[PDB]
Design a binder for this molecule. Structure first.
Ligand code: NA
Length: 111
């Protein structure tokens, strides 16, 4: 069984964010080819997405919740690194990130 905090990341944080109307671009790794970057992987050194995070939770990958939180931070920050302030995807990420912060502020204690 995962830590209680990792269960929270799965059953509250991911579950809530996944259902948000703006979450879908984050469901899978950014495919530079389907969208030839051609430069994406030249700037984005550590790609991350919520599909990967969800799989890691399901597959028991994380040792502690901090690692999962870091993956979310990487996902959001990467979006901002690559995109302009006025881009639709940035507004989408911002909405999701505000929810992420509100939910991780309520993360439970391990007992
Ligand atoms: Na934990």
């Amino acid at each position: 069984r995962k830590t209680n905090q990792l269960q929270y990341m799965q059953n509250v944080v991911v579950k809530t964010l996944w259902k948000h109307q703006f979450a879908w671009p984050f469901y899978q790794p950014v495919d530079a080819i389907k969208l030839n970057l051609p430069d994406y992987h030249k700037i984005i050194k550590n790609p991350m997405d919520m599909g990967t995070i969800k799989k890691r939770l399901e597959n028991n990958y994380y040792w502690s919740a901090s690692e999962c939180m870091q993956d979310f931070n990487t996902m959001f920050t990467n979006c901002y690194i690559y995109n302009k302030p006025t881009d639709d995807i940035v507004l989408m990420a911002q909405a999701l990130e505000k929810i992420f912060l509100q939910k991780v502020a309520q993360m439970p204690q391990e007992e």
